[PDB]
Write an enzyme that holds these catalytic residues in place. Structure first.
Site, PDB file in Angstrom:
ATOM      1  N   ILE A  86       0.869  -1.222   0.000  1.00 37.02           N
ATOM      2  CA  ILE A  86       0.000   0.000   0.000  1.00 37.02           C
ATOM      3  C   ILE A  86       0.911   1.280   0.000  1.00 37.02           C
ATOM      4  O   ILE A  86       1.924   1.338   0.705  1.00 37.02           O
ATOM      5  CB  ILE A  86      -1.019  -0.028   1.210  1.00 37.02           C
ATOM      6  CG1 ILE A  86      -1.899  -1.320   1.260  1.00 37.02           C
ATOM      7  CG2 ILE A  86      -1.926   1.236   1.245  1.00 37.02           C
ATOM      8  CD1 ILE A  86      -2.853  -1.461   2.457  1.00 37.02           C
ATOM      9  N   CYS A  87       0.508   2.349  -0.710  1.00 34.24           N
ATOM     10  CA  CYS A  87       1.052   3.716  -0.490  1.00 34.24           C
ATOM     11  C   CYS A  87       0.002   4.620   0.250  1.00 34.24           C
ATOM     12  O   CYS A  87      -0.983   5.080  -0.332  1.00 34.24           O
ATOM     13  CB  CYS A  87       1.541   4.309  -1.836  1.00 34.24           C
ATOM     14  SG  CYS A  87       3.239   4.954  -1.729  1.00 34.24           S
ATOM     15  N   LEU A  88       0.235   4.872   1.547  1.00 34.69           N
ATOM     16  CA  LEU A  88      -0.257   6.102   2.231  1.00 34.69           C
ATOM     17  C   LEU A  88       0.805   6.456   3.330  1.00 34.69           C
ATOM     18  O   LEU A  88       0.930   5.731   4.325  1.00 34.69           O
ATOM     19  CB  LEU A  88      -1.693   5.857   2.788  1.00 34.69           C
ATOM     20  CG  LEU A  88      -2.433   7.100   3.346  1.00 34.69           C
ATOM     21  CD1 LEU A  88      -2.853   8.069   2.227  1.00 34.69           C
ATOM     22  CD2 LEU A  88      -3.686   6.681   4.131  1.00 34.69           C
TER      23      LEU A  88
ATOM     24  N   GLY B  76       4.719   8.288  -0.909  1.00 36.58           N
ATOM     25  CA  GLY B  76       4.681   6.948  -0.271  1.00 36.58           C
ATOM     26  C   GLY B  76       3.349   6.221  -0.465  1.00 36.58           C
ATOM     27  O   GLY B  76       2.400   6.513   0.259  1.00 36.58           O
TER      28      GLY B  76
END
Lengths: 149, 76
Positions: A86-88, B76
């Site tokens: 995941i990207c956060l 990110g």
């Protein structure tokens, strides 16, 4: 201490069915290694389904962010179609020490509810959502009805 | 009405409003007592995102309801 942290999240998810989360263990009943599972966001390609996430909350928790890796495969710009990852960035890298897993799995539910190519995970799925609004509604609605059962 | 903003921090916010208050004024009242940037503020409410140049009345935001604030960066 990681033992005096997760048992507060386990009891607070047990008392409240309206929050939509299971924190169901990978061993038997430990203090760390969890399937954190949310219910699908409605009126959208991610509606109605169990969204299963494998979680190492690392050794120094409360201070370390969760390693969130999906068993249920999801066709989305911020959440991986091929791997699981995941990207956060403040969820996975730059943590606030008092975020509960009852708040963090409701963050992945709100990340799926209206998709955006902004924090990037699977790069050709972000290229696809910039190009498309017809085969993304074919692939993401089929993947929710099979993988989020 | 006092509508509740669910953060990605632990620290949870009161928002002091009636159905005429702007999504502009929602992002200013979160930058006040939390300090969270307007580009980080991805606000979500039941089938819908909160689009920035709008009212609370557009979305069906009733008294004492939960607004879901996602902190969205660019990397990110």
């Amino acid at each position: 201490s990681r033992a005096k942290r997760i048992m507060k999240e386990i009891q607070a998810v047990k008392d409240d069915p309206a929050a939509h989360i299971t924190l169901e263990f990978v061993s038997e009943s430990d203090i760390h290694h969890l399937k954190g599972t949310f219910l699908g966001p409605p009126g959208t390609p991610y509606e109605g389904g169990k969204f299963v996430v494998d979680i190492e909350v690392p050794m120094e928790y409360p201070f370390k962010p969760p390693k969130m890796q999906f068993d249920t495969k999801v066709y989305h710009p911020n959440i991986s179609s091929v791997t699981g990852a995941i990207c956060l960035d403040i969820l996975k890298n730059a943590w606030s020490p008092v975020i509960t897993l009852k708040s963090a799995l409701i963050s992945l539910q709100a990340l799926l509810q209206s998709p955006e190519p902004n924090d990037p995970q699977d790069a050709e799925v972000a290229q696809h959502y910039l190009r498309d609004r017809e085969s993304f509604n074919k692939t993401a609605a089929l993947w929710t009805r099979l993988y989020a059962s | 009405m006092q509508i509740f903003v669910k953060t990605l921090t632990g620290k949870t916010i009161t928002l002091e409003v009636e159905p005429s208050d702007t999504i502009e004024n929602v992002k200013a009242k979160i930058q006040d007592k939390e300090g969270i940037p307007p580009d980080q503020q991805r606000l979500i409410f039941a089938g819908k995102q909160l689009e920035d140049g709008r009212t609370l009345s557009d979305y069906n935001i009733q008294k004492e309801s939960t607004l879901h604030l996602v902190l969205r960066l660019r990397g990110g």
